[PDB]
Ligand binder design. Structure first.
Ligand SMILES: CC(=O)CC(=O)SCCNC(=O)CCNC(=O)[C@H](O)C(C)(C)COP(=O)(O)OP(=O)(O)OC[C@H]1O[C@@H](n2cnc3c(N)ncnc32)[C@H](O)[C@@H]1OP(=O)(O)O
Ligand SMILES: CC(=O)CC(=O)SCCNC(=O)CCNC(=O)[C@H](O)C(C)(C)COP(=O)(O)OP(=O)(O)OC[C@H]1O[C@@H](n2cnc3c(N)ncnc32)[C@H](O)[C@@H]1OP(=O)(O)O
Ligand SMILES: CC(=O)CC(=O)SCCNC(=O)CCNC(=O)[C@H](O)C(C)(C)COP(=O)(O)OP(=O)(O)OC[C@H]1O[C@@H](n2cnc3c(N)ncnc32)[C@H](O)[C@@H]1OP(=O)(O)O
Ligand SMILES: CC(=O)CC(=O)SCCNC(=O)CCNC(=O)[C@H](O)C(C)(C)COP(=O)(O)OP(=O)(O)OC[C@H]1O[C@@H](n2cnc3c(N)ncnc32)[C@H](O)[C@@H]1OP(=O)(O)O
Ligand SMILES: Cc1cc2nc3c(=O)[nH]c(=O)nc-3n(C[C@H](O)[C@H](O)[C@H](O)COP(=O)(O)OP(=O)(O)OC[C@H]3O[C@@H](n4cnc5c(N)ncnc54)[C@H](O)[C@@H]3O)c2cc1C
Ligand SMILES: Cc1cc2nc3c(=O)[nH]c(=O)nc-3n(C[C@H](O)[C@H](O)[C@H](O)COP(=O)(O)OP(=O)(O)OC[C@H]3O[C@@H](n4cnc5c(N)ncnc54)[C@H](O)[C@@H]3O)c2cc1C
Ligand SMILES: Cc1cc2nc3c(=O)[nH]c(=O)nc-3n(C[C@H](O)[C@H](O)[C@H](O)COP(=O)(O)OP(=O)(O)OC[C@H]3O[C@@H](n4cnc5c(N)ncnc54)[C@H](O)[C@@H]3O)c2cc1C
Ligand SMILES: Cc1cc2nc3c(=O)[nH]c(=O)nc-3n(C[C@H](O)[C@H](O)[C@H](O)COP(=O)(O)OP(=O)(O)OC[C@H]3O[C@@H](n4cnc5c(N)ncnc54)[C@H](O)[C@@H]3O)c2cc1C
Lengths: 383, 383, 383, 383
């Protein structure tokens, strides 16, 4: 047992911190107010090296130099303190797009699609959810028929796709057989700009305004057999396994939003003077701050636990589920308390505290709701 | 003991309901998105009669005809289901402006200022809070000096004033002596358009976008002795007592927002089909709905309790405190759960569920935070 | 609407308060530690007329003179403050025995059986639960075979019977026809001492030590045709409707336990000093006390509302369900908190606060676990 | 970072598990019901070498061979699953007695006093609390007067001493100088049987029945100069630093209780059936179980993190504080829930689930109430 970070992990931590401080911190309030997805920040982010933390140097990563999942995770958490929208933009690329190519991809697919993503040359997306396939990821309407070419044709739509529009490489799931549903989904790689491949209306979301969420529409889109990721009919397995990893990302995002709120409330409590005393002098305030701190620490070691488990090659399915949920709930509790400590000022979008509360809410929903997290843990528990 | 509504109460209930259905419901999403304060809706609202529910016919009200506090409250709750921003606009006028004139005003002040407000001819506001006087309503910088005329001069600012800008009659509190602070605040009536009396920047708030919140600035504003509401140095008493009543309004607002969320989640649970079943078929969903319903009912009888106590002439200080807090907390719990039940769709500002959550948050803050509500109840408890 | 107790309601309340003060309070710690059921005290309680509060004078009750369900509920609450176990022995009789004979019995069965329960010359009990039928009421295995004599022969047993072994008149449900389970259960008035009617295991329980809980055994118990309550097959309906009323009583007991715990905590926080200040002057303490008070107030008005609807003849199944779950959930919370305020002393069985915690847990389980109340409420909600 | 137990850690864990399985489990219900402290079992436990896990071979411990604080913590957790009262008698010795002699004692005092505590030939206890000094440690009234012989005379008493009346070696704190309270407390090694050293009230407690809690009485107790631990005036520092470690143990015990309650609930939900389905197939049940599991995981990693920092020599006061409050708060929750899943049977002292609830409450109060942990953490947060 050990809870000390390696120097390498600290490098990736400090890395995102400096960026978050000099680039993200100043413009976040503007960008969130206007809902601006700043492609230039993303490009700067992507060139930092964080994207290839745990990937082998073979593909242009720091994996062979001591980088690991926890490094990448630590960065996600750090970025989420400054800008949650950007934090999830990064997390989606690595955990949900690069990873599955890296895991289930052939060397050709890796050399072609993985290395750009690892090197920060391209951005990735994950297109699984659609109107009738939410938590039930098998009510998928999207069809993927085979042609005499040996190529496939996709027809469908995807709803709520993070990084949609802005992304270059999309991992898309389609039903190659709608009889064995759960055993008949196939994963495909789509490049931005494929004929027939279009985008729909942009999502009008409650918070996380710096992240771009958009619909995708597939209209007779023909892709080569080469773009098929993994075996035909093994798509559900691929989605679930990559979602296990992503859950650690969302957990880490939730954690960062929470630490953001605590930091804000702590420094505010010392400056706001009412009844002649700074807020921190009133026992209730102090105790709210201490309790928030306890929850944040509780979530923390669970998030890190999962990242370590993953990098070790140990099954982390339940651990991720646990980290995602405890982290998301903490985020929501801690964030709602933070606004309260700021009084009326917390209700103003001039202050950072309101934003955090709005952001906390998606972490209980996307990448599998907290209820599925209950499903994954209980299923394990009852075996 | 009796928990049946009078027909008169049901009249005022049905009244706001029809309005909320035909006028508020259609445009709320637009107005909230754009932050539009629609003066025309307010004018329609004000002519409904709700404003004079518990005021004697003497002043143009329904008080002598069987109208009472609970009637006015029931309407507030009802409007809050459709539009929380409009709900608080109404509540502020009656509870926080008309009432104190009605309670501490001379007949001249009533005939001049009360009857318009009661009849729906004018809108009122309550200007107590300022930068250094939040929960500590005695760090008031606003000065009110006496002149050789016998008239007074006001210099100051007020922050976060609901109905600010839009209102006609403002109840403003100023320090006539800054030595006996808590015993040296005086209440004054200000008419919109008084020279020196200006407004500052409009509040950029997290939710409740349909309510207009603005700063007021007093620059050498001279008012006649006639505009002094109550005795000099008795302002704190007047603010507290009127805040006791308003707390029932905010409680009723919180209740309505909660019922709004429950209604949404209930009908959604029946339409959203996942895994082949509507959401309401999964035990967890049903139980979330049932629990939400229990909290809403718990808050409810507490809100009504306070309104009845007030109309009876019984001291309702603690009851209001209890209603305000339990209602606000329920609103926040129930509202956050509602978004969860809607999945990703709840995170979209296209759906009503996100709005409700954003609104719930002010009810724990304005008109005295939930912590002061703890202060008022515990103070009583330890006597 | 009206939240005022009547003269009569206050009389029954005062009545129970003096019995609690004089007869219950001085011995409760002894009786609880030793787990004794004092038949003399119960016979004393029964002689006060509380048992007849809402039944008509023609059965020996105060119903014809202004006594109502609430008066009886106020009594149960009051007794619960002193001795939770005694409160329930009483609640069981009136709500689970006298009520179904009154509500379903023929005038004959009323003259014979109801009169003594109302007058207090006999105690009653409700036998429904079996080892294979707790929450699943339909799992009845006790059979009620019909004989040539138009007689019945009961064979089976009942588990966890409050007042079991100490009651005179029992209401037992048995399967007359096991084809139509939930439509084939029959209720019978079974008298203690009937040949074949034996008692078994006396339950050793965590709390509520002053209440006797016993197993009933039916070995070839012959019952006359005029002991059938209702009619063949409507025994489930009878039990269900009986349980709605019984639940209002349990909600009341739960309320009473919470009130006792709050009062102990307030009184103690005034006296105990640390750091040179009485406990009540530390803000976390006074806030704790305040929250407790708010919760019990939330539960209170739900308890009373349910009692009034029953006495008014309105449908109250759901109000009973909300009351029981909120009141007990509040009890469990306030209870666990009062022990905390007492510190090391709250963990000592010398002080009363641990007993209140032990007692509080049962209010969540018996007369329908809180989860059943959620089932009841949510089902009504989805109708 | 690393969350892997070592071979040695697993050895001490297995060790405690077999003692629990063989010696503790079969008699626990009897011993708990009768409130007996079995000296033979304790002497058995002490002979396993657990007591010496992290102390060096020169005192008879396994510290020089890979035993560490965590190994001892794993033991405490494990024992707590079977007998919470036994777990704490052990925790008290190692953490509250052997540790301060080791950490503050001279080599002489170590050879004499530490050796037997490490070897397990004597039991130890920690006497700090007084009726006028619980949370306010500074309220010490026991005086330690100096004599011509360079000797000390202790006069006073101590309340609530775990292992009191059964311990050989005691650590008592007494005011050497009452001017500088918090800077004038002194620690002394006091041996059982020293003339003047008597015992008093044996506490009758709600739970943890297998633990002996007794009052210590000091009437003219002469102590030799070389029994002073530390030096005049630094007894508060000693006690504080002793309590940080002790708290990691209490967090562990609390963890163990929670784990026992979860396991009972899982095992039961698999077997018990209602409505024709095993309890674990109703979604509210499996979700409950899942949440419980998540909470205990949250607490687990906080408990272990604190243990590692202590063994690593990092500062751990706050980690101890977070661990103790989370673990106990989780215990109280999981505990109250497992009783619910058992239904009517969970309320019976035949089953183990009620004991776990009774035991869980003390983990929130002793070795520093959770409110103190909040004080500790929040203060460090506002530095
Ligand atoms: C950037 C972003 O923001 C990303 C987005 O949010 S991504 C969109 C998020 N959407 C979701 O998370 C959907 C949530 N739903 C799910 O994860 C799943 O549908 C579910 C957990 C509900 C389970 O569904 P289910 O149909 O009951 O399947 P389940 O019983 O779990 O497993 C079915 C099969 O898949 C296999 N499987 C499940 N999980 C697996 C895993 N992690 N790895 C491999 N195989 C797995 C099972 O072993 C089983 O295989 P066999 O039938 O061959 O034995
Ligand atoms: C539409 C909207 O959105 C409206 C807005 O939100 S309105 C702005 C909301 N702002 C607030 O609610 C401020 C909250 N703060 C307060 O209410 C108070 O300052 C407080 C509760 C914190 C108490 O402050 P305090 O200085 O400690 O005074 P407190 O001890 O309560 O009472 C002081 C005096 O006032 C009197 N007083 C207090 N409450 C009173 C009441 N309800 N009626 C009459 N007198 C009262 C006390 O009896 C005492 O009088 P004496 O000294 O003459 O005996
Ligand atoms: C002293 C003490 O401590 C007291 C004791 O605890 S005794 C109590 C111990 N046992 C319990 O509390 C039992 C808990 N279980 C229940 O309440 C029920 O089993 C339940 C609520 C879970 C529902 O079970 P179910 O089998 O699904 O019944 P359900 O289908 O809802 O209803 C069956 C029929 O009875 C009727 N019914 C149900 N509840 C009713 C009510 N409150 N009033 C009237 N009729 C009712 C239904 O309308 C239905 O009629 P039809 O069959 O003609 O349509
Ligand atoms: C078997 C069992 O069941 C065990 C039992 O329960 S025994 C435990 C029963 N009693 C307790 O748990 C006591 C609870 N109370 C406390 O812990 C403390 O009183 C407290 C945390 C509330 C603080 O009290 P306080 O009087 O405010 O002390 P505080 O001012 O913080 O500290 C006093 C000094 O000691 C030092 N100190 C405090 N905590 C310290 C720590 N953890 N490590 C080192 N030094 C510490 C401070 O730095 C300070 O030094 P200076 O005076 O030189 O500046
Ligand atoms: C900002 C945002 C970004 C997203 N980004 C992506 C992305 O990049 N890629 C992608 O593919 N998807 C993405 N999504 C979609 C997201 O993952 C889904 O919204 C989420 O998985 C929930 O699906 P749903 O909205 O259909 O909820 P539903 O499945 O309709 O569920 C609704 C509610 O019912 C609950 N529920 C459902 N089934 C059960 C059951 N059997 N038992 C109990 N409770 C149940 C759910 O937990 C939820 O509370 C995103 C969504 C948002 C809002
Ligand atoms: C949308 C909106 C509308 C409003 N409308 C009006 C209006 O119409 N009229 C009006 O006059 N005002 C109005 N206000 C102001 C509002 O009532 C105040 O914001 C509120 O009373 C809190 O004051 P504050 O913001 O200064 O918080 P602060 O007083 O700074 O308090 C900040 C935090 O510390 C807590 N706190 C403060 N003192 C203590 C203490 N002693 N012990 C423990 N906790 C403490 C508070 O509860 C809060 O959590 C409005 C505010 C908003 C956001
Ligand atoms: C002291 C005491 C006195 C009692 N007195 C009486 C009395 O006088 N008369 C009488 O007839 N009975 C009496 N009972 C019985 C009592 O009402 C039952 O214990 C209760 O109905 C629960 O049934 P059970 O114990 O079989 O638990 P179960 O029915 O097994 O329930 C166990 C757990 O599973 C949950 N559960 C069960 N079914 C579901 C489902 N479908 N979905 C979700 N969760 C579910 C329950 O809520 C609970 O958490 C008494 C019990 C006690 C302890
Ligand atoms: C079974 C048992 C075993 C024990 N074993 C030992 C042992 O071996 N050795 C030993 O020395 N002691 C022991 N104790 C004592 C124990 O640690 C004390 O009970 C504990 O420190 C609390 O002190 P108190 O009981 O005086 O309660 P109090 O100090 O009166 O505290 C009472 C309540 O007020 C709260 N409170 C107190 N001060 C404040 C404040 N400033 N702000 C906010 N809230 C506050 C507390 O958190 C608690 O809720 C034991 C106790 C028990 C019950």
């Amino acid at each position: 047992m050990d809870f000390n970070l390696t120097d390498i992990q600290q490098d990736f931590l400090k890395l995102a911190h400096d960026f978050g401080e000099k680039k993200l911190a100043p413009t976040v309030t503007e960008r969130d107010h206007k809902g601006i997805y700043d492609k230039e920040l993303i490009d700067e982010l992507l060139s930092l090296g964080i994207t290839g933390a745990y990937f082998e140097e073979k593909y242009g990563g720091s994996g062979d130099d001591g980088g690991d999942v926890l490094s990448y995770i630590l960065a996600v958490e750090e970025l989420a303190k400054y800008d949650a929208g950007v934090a999830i933009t990064l997390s989606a690329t690595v955990s949900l797009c690069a990873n599955p190519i890296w895991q289930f991809g052939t060397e050709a697919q890796k050399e072609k699609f993985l290395v750009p993503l690892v090197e920060g040359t391209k951005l990735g997306a994950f297109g699984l959810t659609e109107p009738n396939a939410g938590t039930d990821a098998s009510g998928q309407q999207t069809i993927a028929t085979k042609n005499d070419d040996g190529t496939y044709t996709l027809n469908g739509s995807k709803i709520f796709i993070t990084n949609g529009g802005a992304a270059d490489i999309y991992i898309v799931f389609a039903m190659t057989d709608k009889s064995k549903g759960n055993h008949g989904i196939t994963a495909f790689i789509l490049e931005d700009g494929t004929p027939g491949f279009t985008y729909g209306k942009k999502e009008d979301k409650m918070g996380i305004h710096t992240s771009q969420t958009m619909e995708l529409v597939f209209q007779d889109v023909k892709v080569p057999a080469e773009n098929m990721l993994g075996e035909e009919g093994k798509g559900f397995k691929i989605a679930m396994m990559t979602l296990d990893g992503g859950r650690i990302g969302v957990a880490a995002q939730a954690l960062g939003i929470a630490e953001a709120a605590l930091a804000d409330a702590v420094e505010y409590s010392k400056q706001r003077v009412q009844f002649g005393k700074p807020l921190c002098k009133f026992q209730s305030i102090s105790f709210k701050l201490a309790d928030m701190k306890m929850q944040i620490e509780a979530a923390r070691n669970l998030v890190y636990k999962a990242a370590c488990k993953k990098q070790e090659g140990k099954p982390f399915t339940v651990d991720a589920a646990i980290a995602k949920r405890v982290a998301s709930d903490v985020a929501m509790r801690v964030t709602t308390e933070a606004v309260q400590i700021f009084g009326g000022y917390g209700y103003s979008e001039e202050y950072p505290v309101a934003r955090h509360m709005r952001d906390a809410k998606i972490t209980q929903i996307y990448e599998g709701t907290n209820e599925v997290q209950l499903m994954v843990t209980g299923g394990a528990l009852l075996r």
